[model samples]
Target chain A: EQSEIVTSKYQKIAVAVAQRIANGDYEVGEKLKSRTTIASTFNVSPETARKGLNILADLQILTLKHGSGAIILSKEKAIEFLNQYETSHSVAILKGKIRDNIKAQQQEMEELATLVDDFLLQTRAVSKQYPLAPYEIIVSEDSEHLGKSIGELNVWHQTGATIVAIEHEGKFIVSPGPFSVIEQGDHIFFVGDEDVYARMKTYFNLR
Target chain B: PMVSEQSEIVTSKYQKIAVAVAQRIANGDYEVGEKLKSRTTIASTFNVSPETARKGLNILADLQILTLKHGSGAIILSKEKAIEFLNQYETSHSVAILKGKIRDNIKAQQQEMEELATLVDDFLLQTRAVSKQYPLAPYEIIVSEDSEHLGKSIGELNVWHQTGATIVAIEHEGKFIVSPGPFSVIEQGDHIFFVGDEDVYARMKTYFNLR
Candidate 1:
């Protein structure tokens, strides 16, 4: 996941500051604010501000000093820098891309929300045909049916439970065959009416 | 005099303040030509930002209901209009009430998104907190007949105990047998699904020597 363009953060800051100058926010030869203040105003670190200013300084748009901070050297240079900066990684271009992506996200979410509502409605409508919930019974060591297969014990005939699957040692076996062995620690997953769980536990002794 | 608004607390908060103020006017709380609180007091009282309160005044002022002033001040223009606006917002979103109801639906949609965003962030925060350790991913290995341990049970081979990987399920004769116990023999052509790290996968592959 490498970045396609490598225009540094400081370069972006330089372009923003240059635009501000070109827009008459700063005058030629006017002293600017402290580097610390500039960094905070732009939501950047103090060190980043220095690098940003350094770009403007090299181009002779602003004069950097140790005590007085920075001062505008030439507004014409700022206007020139902006034209060059526009060729790639332009802020307005990036903003348009971001705006497009946000709208796309918003629209897709709206569709998904409606789809989820539709899914809930459909499931509710057809819920009567199948068991709403699958109940699981653990094959306890104390159970008399330990080591017995689902077919050999006639689990369905005795308790009206429909064997759907079994969980053995943290693994699931869906549609376990009649010959699948049931050992201690195995959990039988089945589907039926509300009373089926109690029926299985009492009649089959599936502790 | 000025047009305004800016969120869950941004748009909805402004909308909330407007309706609450409309109700205040409808119930004979504030009279015609009476100056309600400026944006400062309104913002403070509602515990919202100044711009939110500022925008709140604009909603009523638009319909000539509250006559707006220069610095976010408002004078009640018509009590009847206030009542009308209240009823407009209060009624059902029926077929005859299409536009107004759709506006309400949009409000509800915005509220759902904001609420869902907060809930998702909360879920993600705890998910990251709980998921610091990597989960044991399952790896599938096809057991061919070339293995010396072909007919032996998993326990007899001491699979996980010796090779640092444990079988979770097996595919035998085109059917999936989930979590087969230690008694399940390593029948030829069985596809074993096991769980462990990548290192364990490589280690077990050598031990099985399955083609």
Candidate 2:
């Protein structure tokens, strides 16, 4: 009975700690209870007390500060920062390759072009009619194709489709244009209502 | 003559290029269903001409080691094919992560259950305070004492609720009832098994002056 009570108290303490971190009560950069304080207050073994704090650290809430203590980091900010870091790193490598080899880069870009063509073909083959609004359309092509102006996209949009965005060399482009010559390895977005969007997609003869 | 032999080995560079490509796929440097390098790039990397690289790559393609799409270059085969080719090299990282999460959840639950044992016993004792009768669930027992006392006492009840516990049954005169209704009056000689956290059970026990 005594053992059960101790265990239960420790569990509640862990949940409380987890909830506090999630709720922003223990905001980013805030310090959590010291290991000793947690153990004594919760009346659990130090090893048991460490478990809850460890979970917070694992979820990236409490950043272990080596010598000092655990620093609270907001979950939202951490995810955003990590995403940006991943994109930049991918783009940086591609940029370096582009500078070093244009012909090979062009060939790689062509592969991206083929990817767009393949996707277009698949979409048409599956649905028979060009896809319309609410159903998003994405085009992945080389930078050359991506460079086309919005006017071209507008022409497609007249089918009621709009060029919503592009992901080029790992960077995202929102609201691209027809004049936006589709770049190598660029993923572009097409958005519109059903009827016009369908007609415009067929007009392109994607398949 | 030695130089000529060396050139023969070196000039047969297509085999080396094929091996490097295979190694990258094996290493997971490229994933299945993902696009691979263009001809010109692979040619330069292998220090062989594009035609030679294509020939070497074709040898592997014919062997069904990979699929080489005409305009699309190379694509790693699906996991089904990869596993058939090399079962030992299968990636189990995702499975490992799932198992880890489940283990953590169980540990947390185990702790909560332990604490609840004490809380329940304490609450059972408290019900004896008002009379020989106690409601199985905490909420069913009403203290007609001072409103302030009720609030303070109820505040402690809320603490137990914060822990993961629920009162689902009551025992009155040895009759076990499930989900006892709110208005059910407490009958005498009830040994309530109040399923709640330790903190709540303790507070209830104190109120009824149950040891």
Candidate 3:
């Protein structure tokens, strides 16, 4: 006498029959008892038994003969139905996880984007208020300091400017030391007043 | 006085702002966990209303890409998380395309399974109809000393042609020979399992002297 909280009597009977088939209690090709017999055995009305058997027929777990009773189709078929149910359940769970992961990622990216915009705005505002704005100077082949080291150029003493950074071959070397070499094709960042910048332009022969 | 819908235009404008912020993050211009500007500040900067700016930020917050703190504005979480969205954005589109293929395959498999089950049922039904006259069902059979099938080779008997019956298995010396072929010989005191029609089963019973 298995019992479950199923809403419909037919559904409850269907579930019980399906369970019995799955458990191998009713072997494959074995004929099921008549509707009246089943009704008596399960303590249900013949109509209810017919409905329960019809459910199994719809599922293809049992084949109902015109004159004969229902027959167990295959245990393997019943197992396959259970497998499909489990697979669908697992797929639904996986879909939710993937959706959650994508959602969290989307939120993080938007927040980062806003923060980056604000930082750029602040950088621009700070630069506007500065008299000695940072300038990137590219060292050319004909430049006087090409192939010379930072200490040899004495940039601070000659042009009253200070080298803040160096960009060589796409690599940014921030706060370059005195021993840093000034090579042709290297971009150097410097901060200096208007007069010093003008002197630097002349020193680099940027007329 | 413009005749156009102001609300509709404002909504699109906020959406554009939200997109701009999203692009900036994707461009690697922002650091992870950095705080964003206030809604008022964004409104002034973008020349939009405070409500519009809030709408833009709220969109990002809704997406879980930004965590909006009270009085502190929105903050970024992780670069990997942002990159995850970027990857998933592309992957989700790919998945959408793949979903159709999978659906088609599932339908094909379902049809195939149904056809297979129908064939199996037909096989069982045909066998049952043939063996209906027998006292025992096609599944219920035993080979004993009185059984004619005992000590005969399955190939020699030709049971399939004579009675439309096929031996499925044999229980020999307490062991089962499942799916025994025609070449397999029958032994004494072995229980033979057969499936076929009633006409064939009646002939079989007569041949075995069990009639």
Candidate 4:
């Protein structure tokens, strides 16, 4: 019974040390305190302290190098040791929670997709009635708007179309503000009515 | 010995079913104060005897995670209570390992944040001569047969001192030489990883006359 008590105490001490390592109290390659220090801190015998540290060393969480106090082998390995002690029931529960979270997120995404599709259909129907759709216009080298910022171009005033984005050198700059520059070889994406698109096409001299 | 064997079987079955119930509760499939499936239903669902189902329910009831009623299904007490019970439950080795892995990741992230700050500062200082923000980006280019600087060392080309570009690494025959110093020689067909802006790229292209 006395032996059992000692064993239990040592086990508890080992667990406490593992928790500290897992908590990032000590980093990898750092040396642990001397056995006397551990014994005094935990109010345990030197043998108990040695046994506790030895348990960590056996688990490959620490390396008992000659002349060096127990050195932390790897924080990752220490955490892995701690993880091995989790209950199966808790694991099952955590897995169930993750499954539920995934299911919930999937449902939300599907709902969002449906809502977006409905909005697109509504916009298309309205455009059919009013006569307008989205358009893409490429800025040519000889165009008058070359080297001009979006604010200077005054595209909304000239063509009644909102410049949604600029595609330059294969990179898309979405929702470009007024200060964004228009390079020579840029594809300007716009959203406007049929009249506005026609004006833009004529302005760019695109057949 | 027979009694012990029987006790083990019951304990094993009850633990199995208790885990299943715990999963369902955690999944939000069963809410607090909701009636659990009847023992008959649970038994049919899990292909177990009603006695085994009752044993599982009794385990949860004993932990106050559920309230059992005679001739009625058990009711979930509270998710909080169930979680509290789980905290006190005997942890399996695998579960402990998972917890340890998560803690390790957290520690790694903390270390990464500390290291990233120092690295960014050092990088900015090293590349300050090129540009303030170092608008330069890395590009991997293959050596052409007609290239002029194919056999020259990085020190001989004086790429960083001449043009603002720096040779960050070289990939030769599927092997990578990261942070290749100035003395490292460039071989024919070596893929050179360079960091610089468009102007520097143009200058390097002209200097090598590369395809």
In the order shown, the candidates' DockQ scores are: 0.01, 0.01, 0.01, 0.01
What interface RMSD does candidate 2 have?
28.0
lDDT per residue for candidate 2 within B158-203, as digits (tens), equals: 3232223344555665677876544455433444344543234433
Taken over the whole model, the C-alpha lDDT of each candidate is 0.68, 0.49, 0.62, 0.65
Q: Sort the predicted structures by lDDT, highest score first.
A: 1, 4, 3, 2
Query: Model 1 over residues B1-211: C-alpha lDDT tens digits?
Result: 2223331111245456777888899888887867887778878877788787777777677656787765557788898987765654443322234434544676577667666666655654554343334444477877766776688887766565334466898998888988899898877787888865434455566567533
Worst 10 residues of 2 chain B by lDDT: B85-94
Cα displacement (angstroms), candidate 3, residue A100, comes to 15
Report the C-alpha lDDT of model 1 over A11-100, residue by residue, as the tens digit. 678878999999999989888999999899999998998888887786778888657789888999787556543433323343455556
Model 2: CA > 4 A from native? A1-207, B1-11, B78-211
Error of 4 at B70 (Å): 2.1
Name the 10 consecutive residues with the lowest summed lDDT in model 1 chain A: A85-94
Question: What is the per-residue lDDT of model 2 for residues A2-27, given as tens digits with 9 covering 90 to 100?
Answer: 22222344445556665556556677
Instruction: Give the alpha carbon lDDT tens digit for every residue of A1-207 in model 3.
Output: 144211346655776777788898999988888889989999999998898777667667888865588889878767654443222322234445555655565555556555555665565465445644688877677776677788866565335468999999889999988988877788888875433444455566442
Q: Write the residue-wise lDDT of candidate 4 on B21-62 in tens digits.
A: 866786678898678777799899899999988887777776
- Put down candidate 3 lDDT per residue, B1-211, tens digits, no spaces: 4334442221145455665666567677766667778878878877889897787766566556677766887687655545543443223322234445555655565566556555655655665454443423544355546654566677776454323356788888888877888778766566667764334344344444342
Every prediction's TM-score for the first chain? 0.40, 0.30, 0.41, 0.40
